[PDB]
Every structure is written in structure tokens, then in C-alpha cells.
Amino acid sequence: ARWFPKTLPCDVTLDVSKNHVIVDCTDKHLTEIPGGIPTNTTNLTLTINHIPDISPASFHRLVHLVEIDFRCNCVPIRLGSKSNMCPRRLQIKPRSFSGLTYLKSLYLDGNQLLEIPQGLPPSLQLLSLEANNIFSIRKEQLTELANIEILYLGQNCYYRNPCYVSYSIEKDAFLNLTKLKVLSLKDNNVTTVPTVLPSTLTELYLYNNMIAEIQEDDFNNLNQLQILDLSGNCPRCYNAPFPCTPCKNNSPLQIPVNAFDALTELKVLRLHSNSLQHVPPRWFKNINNLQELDLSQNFLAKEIGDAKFLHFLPNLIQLDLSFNFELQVYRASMNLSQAFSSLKSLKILRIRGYVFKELKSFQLSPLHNLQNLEVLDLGTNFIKIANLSMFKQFKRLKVIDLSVNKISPVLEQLYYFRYDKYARSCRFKSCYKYGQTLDLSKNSIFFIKSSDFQHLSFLKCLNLSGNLISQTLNGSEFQPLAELRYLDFSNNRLDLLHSTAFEELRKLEVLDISSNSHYFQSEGITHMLNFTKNLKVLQKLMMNDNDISSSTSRTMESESLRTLEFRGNHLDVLWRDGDNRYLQLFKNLLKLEELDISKNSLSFLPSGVFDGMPPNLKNLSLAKNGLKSFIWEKLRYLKNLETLDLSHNQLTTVPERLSNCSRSLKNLILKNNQIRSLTKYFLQDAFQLRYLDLSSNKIQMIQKTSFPENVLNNLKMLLLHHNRFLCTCDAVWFVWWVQHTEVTIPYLATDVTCVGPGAHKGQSVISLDLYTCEL
Amino acid sequence: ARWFPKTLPCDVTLDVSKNHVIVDCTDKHLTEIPGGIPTNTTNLTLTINHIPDISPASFHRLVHLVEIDFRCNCVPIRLGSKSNMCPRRLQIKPRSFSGLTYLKSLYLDGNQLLEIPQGLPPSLQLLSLEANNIFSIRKEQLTELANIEILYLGQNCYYRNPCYVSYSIEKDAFLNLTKLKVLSLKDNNVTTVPTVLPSTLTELYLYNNMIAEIQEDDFNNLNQLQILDLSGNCPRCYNAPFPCTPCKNNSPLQIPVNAFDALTELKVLRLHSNSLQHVPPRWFKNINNLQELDLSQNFLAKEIGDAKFLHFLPNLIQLDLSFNFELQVYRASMNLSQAFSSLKSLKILRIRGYVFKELKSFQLSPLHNLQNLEVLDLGTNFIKIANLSMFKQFKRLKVIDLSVNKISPVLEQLYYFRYDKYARSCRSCYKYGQTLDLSKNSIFFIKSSDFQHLSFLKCLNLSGNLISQTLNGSEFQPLAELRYLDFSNNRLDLLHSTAFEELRKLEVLDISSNSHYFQSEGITHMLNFTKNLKVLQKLMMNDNDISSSTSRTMESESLRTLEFRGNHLDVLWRDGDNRYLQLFKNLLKLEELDISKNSLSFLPSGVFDGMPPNLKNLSLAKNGLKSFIWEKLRYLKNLETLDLSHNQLTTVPERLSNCSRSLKNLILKNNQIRSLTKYFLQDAFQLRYLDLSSNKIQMIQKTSFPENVLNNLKMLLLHHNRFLCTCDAVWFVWWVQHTEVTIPYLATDVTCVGPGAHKGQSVISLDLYTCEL
RNA sequence: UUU
RNA sequence: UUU
Ligand SMILES: *[C@@H]1O[C@H](CO)[C@@H](O[C@@H]2O[C@H](CO)[C@@H](O)[C@H](O)[C@H]2NC(C)=O)[C@H](O)[C@H]1NC(C)=O
Ligand SMILES: *[C@@H]1O[C@H](CO)[C@@H](O[C@@H]2O[C@H](CO)[C@@H](O)[C@H](O)[C@H]2NC(C)=O)[C@H](O)[C@H]1NC(C)=O
Ligand SMILES: *[C@@H]1O[C@H](CO)[C@@H](O[C@@H]2O[C@H](CO)[C@@H](O)[C@H](O)[C@H]2NC(C)=O)[C@H](O)[C@H]1NC(C)=O
Ligand SMILES: *[C@@H]1O[C@H](CO)[C@@H](O[C@@H]2O[C@H](CO)[C@@H](O)[C@H](O)[C@H]2NC(C)=O)[C@H](O)[C@H]1NC(C)=O
Ligand SMILES: CCCCc1nc2c(N)nc3ccccc3c2n1Cc1ccc(CN)cc1
Ligand SMILES: CCCCc1nc2c(N)nc3ccccc3c2n1Cc1ccc(CN)cc1
Ligand SMILES: *[C@@H]1O[C@H](CO)[C@@H](O)[C@H](O)[C@H]1NC(C)=O
Ligand SMILES: *[C@@H]1O[C@H](CO)[C@@H](O)[C@H](O)[C@H]1NC(C)=O
Ligand SMILES: *[C@@H]1O[C@H](CO)[C@@H](O)[C@H](O)[C@H]1NC(C)=O
Ligand SMILES: *[C@@H]1O[C@H](CO)[C@@H](O)[C@H](O)[C@H]1NC(C)=O
Ligand SMILES: *[C@@H]1O[C@H](CO)[C@@H](O)[C@H](O)[C@H]1NC(C)=O
Ligand SMILES: *[C@@H]1O[C@H](CO)[C@@H](O)[C@H](O)[C@H]1NC(C)=O
Ligand SMILES: *[C@@H]1O[C@H](CO)[C@@H](O)[C@H](O)[C@H]1NC(C)=O
Ligand SMILES: *[C@@H]1O[C@H](CO)[C@@H](O)[C@H](O)[C@H]1NC(C)=O
Ligand SMILES: *[C@@H]1O[C@H](CO)[C@@H](O)[C@H](O)[C@H]1NC(C)=O
Ligand SMILES: *[C@@H]1O[C@H](CO)[C@@H](O)[C@H](O)[C@H]1NC(C)=O
Ligand SMILES: *[C@@H]1O[C@H](CO)[C@@H](O)[C@H](O)[C@H]1NC(C)=O
């Protein structure tokens, strides 16, 4: 169905709305630009390869190029692979880009360049040079960039990519870049704000540098600046997980009180880790539009209790004051200045790492009439004592986060302590939705009783993950929580002695009791797995990693439940050959459509398992079980089966006729097994099949009988990579069909390969010429 | 160095003291008895194969055979592999054993036999027929067994191997077995004690059957009986993890009060899971030598508060009353009858699953004057309250076990609830002194008074509690002699470098799986807490997710072993950050360092220079290591064991001798090595152990493997590679066939992958003469 | 393989 | 592959 097989090792896409032909050669172990890139190419990506040089030949025919992504073909030593270090910085020969009349975006990050590449066409709007070795900027090397709007020069001189000197920027080096909008000089060992900058700037990134002082006029002309980041100059180095050098004498970054006077358009101001001890109100007198203010990682503990500057910020949306605690101090309470009430627009308040023993209702009173407050983050504070009922005055909030505290009656794990949380990689460029959420995860709650939740009926999601609850819930513990839709109870020590546990949460839709294995690990203890009958609107139950190998009740019942995750348990033990008592454990989950019973050590399936399955099972995972055998005919019992996941097992054969096993099956995942061949008529008349993963097996040959083309043409996707294909003349049909087929087959260029015979070993099947079989 | 390669796929062993030549063919995927078993063979094992038949041809020349272990060549359907089911029962042809004049032991278990094999020689002392399909015993089928002493017939009729009828034993079927000592009829659907049995019996196993009544005759003549097991007749089925059928009318196994009168030599009596409600003293009036008594899994909760029968048991060493609780009852306290004080000889007391809210010292007073008491096991009792000081009155005990309770201010994982805890297969801090096991309880806070009056303790087990606390050295102050603290599976907060420093005698410290506070960014951790522990020998901090440390070094003058598995040294040693490259350098006496499973995909230079000077044993396993600068091994001048298993290395050093002149054990299994350097092991004379298994090696020439090195090796592992058995392989194949060196799995997995002709063929069996024409 |  |  194709007259010309595609052999280029890059994904090619056409977006003819925007007249884009996109050629993505990311990470193809290329040592040369591949030949035969389409002449109409507009966006070309060659990131993560080992192409040692660029020359006028590189893009000779590619005159329609709009974007070139040529990053990380020689990344600096400490930043790159220690198994394939780059031997020499990329070589860019003269003329290499001058002919690209339409070039608008050029990425040359991560190539060990020593200088700003010259000869760039005047069409260029974006130039990216992060993670090179360019640490002296001269006006003359920037003349060629007259039309530039976006310029990235960071990560060229810092601990992971050292240049061993101060960064150097000539006076007015950027002044004649009259269109420059975005200037990034982060992570560069800069010692002063370079001046004068063009008044067109909207975004300026100077963070993680060696700037000790702002001159009063450094930002004088930037009346268009919208984002200003000066973080990490005079860092707060306590507990930094990167080499960190503070300013002398615990000095803060010094900022004159009038330094921001011209920035009338400023929306974002980041002063993270600048060792600030005061926030003078004078700073914000001519900025009335500020929306986001990051003041995390300073020494503003006392200032939080005063904080006159908040009065000048009626429009502020986000305020971050996290990690301002004074060293070695465990305050008794949280002193929030009354000035907080002046933050009429405030949506998000974050004060992690204030460090205080006891939170009491009045202490939040400055916040009671902030009408737009949606998120209040008091995590990592070592709070020991908290009357949860105080949040009855915060029913309007979307998320109350008390995660990681010591209480006892979404940002990344590494966030406040990252070096550069906005760093770009070489590759590219949750229950909140249910309503009001009270996150008490990773605290020290060992016992709960119903009064702990008095006045919180409004809650829709409660997160108790990772506490120390080691209790036999009987339905009395959660009684105020009349609207709760989601309880995360994972990583506790639930003792399911009573089948009435959780029954008071009459509106519960999702229950996570995963990783509550403790009491399931000791023999002879009663466990009531039929606690589900009482939850009349429960949709989804997660019981992963509970090590369940025994159950006092023999069936689980639900009229509502649609999804059960039962991964990481011991159904091999409950279904021990000879023991029939648990073969209908899920049969009475009458509405169940999704069942994950992966990772249950099921090396075989006892007969009666499939008969025991509830009648509407659609999506069944048996992955990661060490299944050594499988009676495909037993799928006939599963009359609604659409998705069968058998990946990461030990199967050696597929059914003789998959259609004779299941008339409903649409998605068959067989990846990571031991299959060495397909049955003669494997997919004959399997009209419902849409998705088939045979990758990571040991298949040597595939004949046309196994793969009838009326079936192949219905497949959305057919995965065949990482097998042991034998490219002899017996493979002529398969090699021809792979080369000419419309069916989507991932990794044809990278991982659909001959293992032999010798002559063809390691060769891609897509590129195989078998004319010697037709002489 | 040997003139005739061994080709037999069995380990052959000589014990010339006992004139035994031992031939072990266990699990070699054999479908026939291999040819060429040494003719002098005495012990021959063929367990776990698929030999379909035995015939006179089987052991024709092997007339010196004393033992034949021919088990599990046709396991019953539900007991065996469901991926390789046995299609037809083992076929034993006539004569097959009559000529084995010296045969003393015959194991034919797990072969689906329907009848007792006949024609067995008169020399036979031991016959084993477990897990077959023989469920009717007839006196005439037992004549041939006149000299038999040990006879195993169990597991021929039970839930995993059903026979669908009652077991059948004819009257006096065993009476003429005049030397028979051991009789096992367990797990057999037996309905009555077979009678009459020979008085020569020492051991009788009738457990897990359908025996509802003991007749008073039943044990009348067995005055040499030493062990009697009647457990699992009328089982207590509550929470049984197997199909369990109780006797009707909630009846117990009924035993007349004089049933044991003749058992004067009885040392062991097992009545586990017989649904007993009373233990009549009269049972034990003529047995005063009973040592071991198991009464677990009955309904003896109230009887424990009475227990007159104990007065008749002055010689008893072990007493088990575990899991006798009444269903749905949570007693307030433990009512131990004073009769326990009459158990003068008792060393081991076990009372799990009594189930009571609060333990107070008074309840243990009946035990105060049992001078030999060594073990008191009160685990799985859901105790909420216990003043630990009550055990000041028990300093004599070796182990006090409160494991799995709800306290708050080694037997198998499955033991009391196993079907047959003694079934045959086909194929810890106690030593430190007095141990208090509080593992798997609900302790969330500790303070020094919790251990008042317990200074005598040598090992404290707090594993798996809920301790989420910033220890400063004040918490364990009474425990002045403690040598072993297990603190694993808690939530330790290492804020203070003075944690544990009060345990002045601590030699072993496990703080593994205390990851909680290590997973949250920006929290202070003092990994230098070791400086204060002056006699600490072994420190375990596995699986803590450690990726940050406020202190830059760990200091110890005593520590010899550090386990640091399952952490993030990859973060601490991020390229560019030099701060933690001497984290372990000042552990000056450290000999063993486990830093496997630390995501070390590379090692920053300086890691090796940072190692303490006396490092002997280093594990870098399971790190995803893609590269390794072998030359930096020169810094490790005392290195004896290097574990690099389960990584992604593709090469070995050009000269291992130029990398380490001390290295003795190099473990490289499960990597990506596809060839060896030209002179790999040249002059590596001290090397004793080399594991290259599970790699992709195609060829090995003699330059890489000089014979002056290879023959000094205790063991050399090469299995599961990609050997290409062409004429270029002639040296390697010849040497593998003729070497004295131990190479495991030569019979099963030292294989040619090609060329085609020789694909799948073992190199040990390889003929390469066409290379010498 | 810019974190 | 007798648990
Ligand atoms: C192809 O290249 C063009 C230009 O480099 C990309 O267009 C930019 O897309 C971003 C996405 O937010 C816009 O903000 C810019 O304004 C666009 N710039 C120009 C000059 O058009 C386009 O996204 C690229 N497409 C692909 C698929 O790579
Ligand atoms: C940032 O610049 C400083 C100086 O401005 C560099 O510091 C010098 O480094 C050399 C070589 O390491 C030393 O011999 C000098 O003593 C240092 N001078 C000072 C004043 O500290 C520093 O190396 C640069 N940082 C990076 C990452 O390149
Ligand atoms: C070889 O076979 C003999 C007999 O089958 C084994 O000897 C028995 O070992 C037990 C162990 O205590 C003794 O109680 C028996 O009395 C021995 N039988 C005798 C002496 O006839 C011997 O252990 C076997 N050895 C091996 C390695 O299989
Ligand atoms: C133990 O023996 C009993 C008989 O006492 C067997 O039970 C019989 O089983 C068949 C088939 O299942 C039934 O038709 C009979 O009615 C049963 N008889 C009785 C009295 O219940 C039982 O199967 C045997 N157990 C094993 C494991 O073989
Ligand atoms: C050996 C114990 C098997 C039965 C059992 N299972 C549990 C369990 N999972 N949690 C408990 C928690 C507290 C007290 C008793 C039990 C208990 N118990 C004992 C018990 C169960 C039920 C009752 C009646 N409330 C009293 C006592
Ligand atoms: C963002 C906090 C980093 C420093 C830190 N680390 C810890 C820690 N591991 N545990 C604590 C436990 C209680 C109170 C404070 C801390 C604490 N703290 C704060 C703190 C530490 C020590 C002291 C003096 N006891 C007061 C306050
Ligand atoms: C809070 O701190 C401020 C300044 O640090 C102080 O003026 C104020 O009185 C304090 N208030 C309370 C309630 O502690
Ligand atoms: C918590 O505060 C509520 C009022 O919001 C009150 O009803 C309750 O008594 C308080 N509980 C405790 C333990 O102080
Ligand atoms: C609850 O918190 C844990 C840990 O903080 C987090 O992993 C989990 O995703 C949260 N649960 C929900 C439902 O968002
Ligand atoms: C459930 O637990 C609560 C608190 O322990 C108790 O008041 C109640 O009696 C228990 N039993 C029930 C609700 O049946
Ligand atoms: C749960 O099931 C078991 C028997 O299968 C029984 O012990 C218990 O009464 C049942 N309880 C409920 C609420 O279904
Ligand atoms: C099937 O279930 C898995 C989760 O177990 C999910 O990731 C997958 O998308 C599901 N597919 C369909 C078609 O429901
Ligand atoms: C399988 O095929 C046979 C013969 O074609 C047919 O009789 C039988 O009904 C089929 N079974 C199913 C479930 O399609
Ligand atoms: C402490 O108890 C745990 C769990 O009960 C056990 O695994 C561990 O081996 C014990 N510690 C020692 C040192 O024996
Ligand atoms: C250690 O901490 C405990 C915990 O409360 C405290 O009672 C004690 O004063 C502290 N001791 C020292 C020596 O710091
Ligand atoms: C551990 O190191 C810190 C410095 O990081 C120091 O303050 C503390 O005193 C040290 N403690 C010991 C016992 O060495
Ligand atoms: C080396 O250490 C491992 C544990 O990390 C141990 O199991 C092994 O026996 C040690 N070998 C020697 C010779 O000390």
C-alpha cells in the first residue's frame, strides 16, 4: 500500500494547516545528518546525537527551514553521559546557516561551543546557547542578531559546567538588540547586572549568579519588563544539595529601595534564596500590577510577623514565603502579620519551612476574609498540634496542605531545594479535582476518632497517606465527613477486622487502602475483604501492595464498583491449586470493568478463575506474574473482555486462533515474554482486534497466514520491536510487508532489527534489500 | 589435567571413608537414566526429572547401590508444575529392584504410583511412597517388607492430591513388620487408628486425617513409642488457609482417658488442631518422661486457667498453647493457672493467640520459679498495655517474645496455620544474649523509663513499630549492656548526632527502612552520629532513600561493616559536587561496604580515593553501572572481594593485575560483556573466584585465560553466555572438558549458541575433531 | 545527555 | 516439582 518505503531514521509529520513538515531525529545515535531529509523541511530536530560538525552541506537543500533543534551533540563533560563522553566540541563551519533565509529558531545548546556562532541569518528570532562554554559577551559578536527577540545564554559557567572566571559582558552589549524580549543569563557566574539593556525586555533571568548588589539604575529603562528573576544571588546555603557559596558576612543581595521604580508592568518577581532579612515597602510603590512574588529561602522569619510591604500588593495572586526559618529555632506558633488581610487578590499562599510547634485557629485570622484564597500550603513545618476544625472557616479553599508535619491527636518532591528548577533537558523544551482537599499526608496520626473532623462536612478529599494509623476501623471514625468523595488511606496500618469499616463515608467514590500490608503479613489474623458491600457509590478501590494471602470472607460484593486495583498481593496463595474457596472472590463485583491483578505471583491460573470473574470485566491485567502457561480458550468465559495485559511474563506460545478464544478482545499486550513463533493462523478472522504488542519476545519469523491483511488493516498499532528476526530468504514476505505497510509500527528505525544471518546482523529490516532471493 | 573428560550430566562424589560413590542427577531435565553411571555407585539420586519408566535395565550394572532417590518424576497434577504436567504415571517393570542385593533406601515419592512396588529386596530398611495415589494398604502387599524399619505413606489422599474415598488399612496389616520403627500415614483421609501395630514402633504420625475417635486398645502394645502425632483430627478450622472440615457437632477428637497408659517411653505428644476443650490429667498418669507437648489450635482458653494436668508433667521441656482463644472474645487479662509452677523442667513456653488486652506482671507469677525457662512466647495476642519492667523478674530467659501486638505507651513466617509444617520438598540477634522482641507493635514514642530495670538486655528488637522521633541519646538510658538494637522499619529522625550514644555497649545497629524523614527535602540529617559509638561493629542503613546529609563525613574507629544499600549516593555524588566524596573515609576500620542499589550509573573520580584504607569487600551490584575505570582500583589496596553483578558493564580491564594485586573474588555476573581483553588475567595469581555468568561472551582465548591463573581458581563461573563453537574455540572447549576447576552448570547451561550445527549443544559434549583433519 |  |  506504499510504493516508496520510508527509510529515513526520523519521524516525519505534516501539519498542512501551518505548512510545517516536521522531521524529528531525536536520539537516533547519528554520526551524520541523515541523507534524504525532505526538501520541504521546516522543523528539524537532531538533539542527542553525535554529529561532530555542521557545514554548508548540512542544510544545503533545506532552504525552507524555520527551526533547527541541534542540541546536545556534544554536551559538557559533567553534564553528559559518562559512558559516551564527547571527544570534541561541535565544529560549525562558515556559511553553515547564512543561506537559511527563513530560519527563525536555532537551538545549539549542549555542544561545548566556545563563542557565539556567527553568520546567522537576519530572520532569526530565537537563539539558544545554554550549556556551552561561552562566558564573555562582546557587542561585536551580537551585531548579527539585530532582529533577535529570545536569547538564552545560561548554564555556561556554574558548578556542573565551570569556566573558572567571572562572566564578562561588555557595556551596552545588548543595547542595540532593539527587539530583544527575553534575556536569560542564569547559572553563569555573572557579577553585575549588565547595562544598559534594551527597553523592549519583557523577561529577564539573572538567577544563580554572583551578583551582590543591584545598582539603583540597573533596571531604569525597562518599563516593559514583566518577569524579573534575581534569585540565588547571595544564596541561603543551609541544607543546599549543591555546592553553595554565600555572600560575605551573611550579607543579603543588596537592592536599593528605588531599584524597581521603572518596572510599572512587572507581573513576576522572584527573590528566592537571596538571604533577605527585610522586604522594604518602598520596593513596591510604583509596581501596582505584581501578580507573583517568590520570597522563599531567605531569612524573613521575623519579617513575616510584620510585613508592611503586603499593603502595597492588592493585586498579588501568589505569595511564597517558604523556608525562612531561623537556624536552630523551633518556634512555638506562627506569627502572621495582620498585613496579610490586605492581599485582596491572593489565590495561593505558601509558607513551608517556617518551623513551629502548634497551629491555632486565631493565627490564620489575617486570612479569614481573603475571598479568592484557593491554596494554603503549610507543609514541612514540624507542626505537632493542630485542631483540624479551624478549617471550617476555609470552606472556600480548594487545597489545604499540611503534608509532612508531625501532627497527631502539585509541586515536585524536590522543589525548594533544587538548584535550577526551570532547567531544560536535552530531550524537550491526584484528588484535587473532586473539590475541597485536606492533605494530612506524611504526618504522625496514629489514631483517629470522629470528633477529629468536627465541622469539616464540606470536605471532598481527605489525604491520610503515610500516617501511622494502626486501628480497626469500624465505621465510627469518619462520621462528620458526609460529603467526602475520595479518601487516600494508603501507607498506613489498617486492620480490616470489621466489614463495617468506612461505611460512614456514604458519598465515597474512591478509596485507596494500598500499602496497608502490616496486619496482612501475620498469620491467623481475621481480615474482612467484604467491607465493600456497604459503600453504595464506590467506583474505584485500590488495594495494591497489601501482601494479601488470606481472607476470612470468601467474596467481595459491590453494586457500584467499576475499578479494582489488586496488584502486589498473593492470589497465588489464595488460589492454591486444590483450594476452591476463593475462586469467586471478585464474581459479585457486578459492575466491575477494570481489574488489575498484576504482580500476584500467578505462575499459572487455576481453572475456575475465569469463570469466577464478574460478568462485565473489560480490562484485565495479569502482567508481571511469572505466568509460564496460559489456556487461551478460557478467555471465552470473559464475554466483555476488550483489553488483556499479559506483559512481563513467561509465555512461549500464542493461541492457534485468537478469534476462537475471544470474540470481544480488542487490545492484546504480550510484550516482554518468551514467544519464539506465531501459530499458523494466529489472527485469522480476529475482526475485533485493534491493538497488538508483541515486542520484546524472541520471534524469528512471521508468515502471512498468521497476519491476514483484513485484520492488519484494522490495527491502530502493531508493536514488533526487539525480537530475534531472522532475515533469510524465508522472511521475504515479512520484510516486504514491513517495508510497504501503512500500519503504525514504532521503532522501525531503531529497534526492528535482524539478528542474522551474520551478513545482515544488526541491520534494520526496513532497509533490507532481498533481491538476491528473486534472481 | 584430566585424561578422560567427565561427560555424565550428574555430579559424582567419592566418600572413600564410607565406601560411597555419590551420583547426584537432581534436576537435569533427564528423560532416561543417563548411560555410564559409575558401576561402583552406592547413592544414586534422580529427583525432579522426567524418566517415564524403570526396568531391569535401569540398574543392571549398579549392583552396589544402597540408596535410590527416584522421587518426583511424575508429581501429582495439583502438586507439580502446571507448565510441564506429567502425562502418565511412572511405569515400574517387574524385577526392577530384586537384584539390588544391597539396597537399603528406596524413595519413590511423587510418581503417581497406584500400588506398593513389589519385588523389593529383603535388605530394604527405608521405603518412601509419599505423594503417590496409594490409598489401600493390604497385608499381602507388605510381606516383601519384612526387614523394613522406616515407612512413609503420607500425602496419598488429601485436598491437594485427592483420592475421593476413605483410606483403607487392613486389620493387622503392619503387625508382621517386626523391625518397623517409623510409620507415617499423615494427610491420608484415614478414619481409624490402624490396629494392631507392631510394638517395635518408635514414631507414629497420624496427623491431618479423619480420625474421629481413639479406641482404648489403639496404643496398647506400643511401649517403645517415643513420638505420637494425632494433630489435625477434628481440626480447629477458624481462619484455616486450606480447605478445612471440622468434626460434626463441634466435636473434638475423643481420646479415652487411659488411651496413653502404655506409652511409658513417650517423649513427644502432638495434639495440634484437635478442637480439644479439656485436657484430662488422667491422660498422663503413666507417662512421666514426656518432653514436648503441642496443644496449639484447640479451644483450651478456659482450660489454661485451670490446667490440673500440668501437675503430671514434671519433665516437660516444651509446652505450646498457642491459638486457643475463643472466637470473638477479647479478654482483659491472661488467666494462667498456678499449675504452671509445677513444670520444673520447662525451657520453652509458647502462648500465641490467647488474645487479651493487658499484660501485668502478676499474671506471670506462676512462672517466677521455673528455673530452666528459656523462651516465653506471647506473640500475636493483641496486647495493648505491658509494663516492660515486669521482665526484670525474668533475666534468666534467653528470648521474651512480644512480636505482633498492639503495645504502645525463630519459627517460620507461616507456622501455626500451615497444613503440614513437616512436609518434604522434592529437592537474628538471639546469640547476643537476652532478647526482648517488640517487633511489629504500635510503639510511637520511647523514653528512658520504658526500659527501667532491664539493664541486663543484650538485644532489643523494635523493628516495625511507629517510632517517629528525634533521638538525642536520652531514650535508651537503662539499657547499659545492650549489644544489638534492631530499629528497622520505623521513622527515625536523625536530627541529632548524639542519637544512640547512650548505648555504650552497642555492637550492631540496624536503622534500615527508616526512609520517611529522608524523603522530604530540606530536612537536617546527621550521618556522623557514629563517632560516639565506640564499640559499634556493624551498622545497617539499607533502604533509607538517603540523598542528602548535613554532615560530610561518617567517623568511627570501630565500625567494620557498613550496609548502605538502597540509597541515593548517585545524588550525593552528582558530578560537580565534591562534598561527600569522603563520606566513608574516616570509617578507619571498615572492611565491608555494601553500596549496591544506589543508582550509581557511573562513579565520579575520587570515590575510590575516598574509600577507607582497610576496605576488603565492596559491593557495587544493581547500580546500572555503564562504565568503570578499572585503574582506580589501585587505590583500594586491601580489596579482596569486588561485587559488580547486575550492572551494564561491557568490558573488563586490559590487565587485571595492573588494577589490583589483592583482588581474590571478582563477581561480574549479569552484565553486558561481549568479549575479554587479550591478556585479561595475565599474572593475576592471587585471584581465586571469577563469575562471568549471564553475560554475552562469544569467545575466550588462552591469552585472556592463562592456565597458570585458571587452575588456581576455587570456582570459575561461565554459564549463560553466547559461546560460538567454531574451530577458533578449540582451546576453550578442550580446556573446559579437561579442567580440574569447578565450573557449575556444565551439564545444563554451558552451551554453544552456534554455529547452527552445534546450536544449543553443551560444550562439555562437543566434538571438534573436524578441526584437526 | 542542560534537571 | 510433596511446603
Ligand atoms: C516549528 O518552528 C516554529 C518556529 O521555530 C515554532 O513556532 C513557535 O511556536 C511557539 C510555541 O509556543 C510560539 O510561541 C512561537 O511564537 C512560534 N514561533 C514562530 C517563529 O512561529 C513551531 O512551534 C515549531 N513546531 C514544531 C512542531 O516543532
Ligand atoms: C566563578 O568566578 C570565580 C572568580 O570570579 C572563580 O573563582 C576562581 O577560581 C580559580 C580556579 O578555581 C581559583 O584559583 C581562584 O582562587 C578563584 N577566584 C575567586 C575570587 O574565588 C570560580 O571558579 C568561577 N566559578 C565557576 C563555576 O567557574
Ligand atoms: C547414602 O545412602 C545411605 C543409605 O541409604 C545413607 O545412610 C543413612 O543415613 C542416615 C542418617 O542418619 C542413618 O540414620 C541411616 O542409618 C543410614 N543408613 C544406613 C547406615 O544404612 C547415607 O546417608 C546416604 N548418603 C548420601 C550422601 O546420600
Ligand atoms: C475422604 O473420604 C471421603 C469419604 O469419607 C470423600 O468424600 C466423598 O467424596 C465423593 C466425591 O467427592 C462424594 O461423592 C462422597 O459422597 C463423599 N463421601 C462422604 C462420606 O463425604 C473425600 O473426597 C475424601 N477426601 C479426599 C481428599 O480424598
Ligand atoms: C488471633 C486473632 C484472630 C481473630 C482476630 N483478628 C483480629 C484483628 N485483625 N484485629 C484485632 C484488633 C483488636 C483485638 C482483636 C483483634 C483480632 N482478633 C481477635 C478478636 C476478634 C474479634 C473480637 C470481637 N470484637 C475479639 C477478638
Ligand atoms: C526545614 C527544617 C530544617 C532544619 C530541621 N531539621 C529538622 C529535623 N530533622 N527534625 C526536626 C524535628 C522537630 C523540630 C525541628 C526539626 C528540624 N529542623 C528545624 C529545627 C531543627 C533543630 C532545632 C533545635 N532542636 C530547631 C528547629
Ligand atoms: C509578631 O512579630 C512582630 C514582629 O516580628 C511583632 O511586632 C508582633 O508583636 C508579634 N506578634 C505576636 C502575636 O507574637
Ligand atoms: C477544636 O475546635 C472546635 C471548634 O472549631 C471545638 O469544637 C473542639 O472542642 C476543639 N477540640 C479540641 C481538642 O480542642
Ligand atoms: C496524598 O499524598 C501523597 C503523599 O503526599 C501523594 O503521593 C498522593 O498522590 C496524594 N493522594 C491524592 C489522592 O492526591
Ligand atoms: C466502634 O468504635 C467506637 C470507638 O472505639 C466505639 O464507640 C463503638 O462502640 C465501636 N463499635 C460499634 C460502633 O459498633
Ligand atoms: C463477610 O463474609 C464472611 C463470610 O464470607 C462473614 O464472616 C461476614 O459475616 C460477612 N460480613 C458482611 C458484612 O458481609
Ligand atoms: C486498561 O487498564 C490500564 C490500567 O490497569 C490502563 O492503563 C489502560 O489504559 C486501560 N485500557 C483501556 C482500554 O481501558
Ligand atoms: C471455535 O471453533 C469451532 C470450530 O470452528 C467452533 O465450533 C466453536 O464454536 C468455536 N468457538 C468459539 C468460542 O468461537
Ligand atoms: C526483629 O524482628 C523482625 C520482625 O519480627 C525480624 O525480621 C528480625 O530478624 C528481628 N531482628 C533480629 C536482629 O533478629
Ligand atoms: C533529649 O530529649 C529528651 C526528649 O524529651 C529530653 O527529655 C531530654 O532533655 C534531652 N536530653 C538531652 C541530653 O538533650
Ligand atoms: C556532625 O557534623 C556537624 C557539622 O555538619 C557538627 O555540627 C556536629 O557536631 C557533628 N557531630 C559529631 C558527633 O561529630
Ligand atoms: C562480601 O559481602 C557480602 C555482603 O555484602 C557477603 O554476603 C559475602 O559473603 C562477603 N564475602 C566475603 C569474603 O567477606
Side-chain angles (χ1 to χ4, degrees), chain B residues 403-404 428-430 435 437 439-440 459 461-463 484 486 488:
Chain B
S403 198
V404 189
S428 184
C429 75
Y430 296 155
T435 301
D437 189 345
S439 64
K440 296 166 167 292
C459 172
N461 197 336
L462 296 173
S463 187
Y484 200 126
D486 191 334
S488 73

Side-chain angles (χ1 to χ4, degrees), chain A residues 731-750:
Chain A
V732 177
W733 174 79
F734 174 68
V735 174
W736 175 84
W737 172 87
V738 156
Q739 284 170 354
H740 294 97
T741 189
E742 318 262 27
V743 183
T744 315
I745 302 164
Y747 312 104
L748 284 183
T750 87

Side-chain angles (χ1 to χ4, degrees), chain B residues 528-542:
Chain B
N528 58 354
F529 72 97
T530 39
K531 177 190 274 317
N532 303 326
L533 309 165
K534 304 300 190 158
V535 291
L536 192 60
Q537 308 281 24
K538 174 158 150 175
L539 173 60
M540 291 151 286
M541 41 196 327
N542 301 306

Side-chain angles (χ1 to χ4, degrees), chain A residues 636 657 659-661 663:
Chain A
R636 297 181 181 147
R657 292 195 292 115
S659 54
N660 196 251
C661 293
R663 285 156 170 172

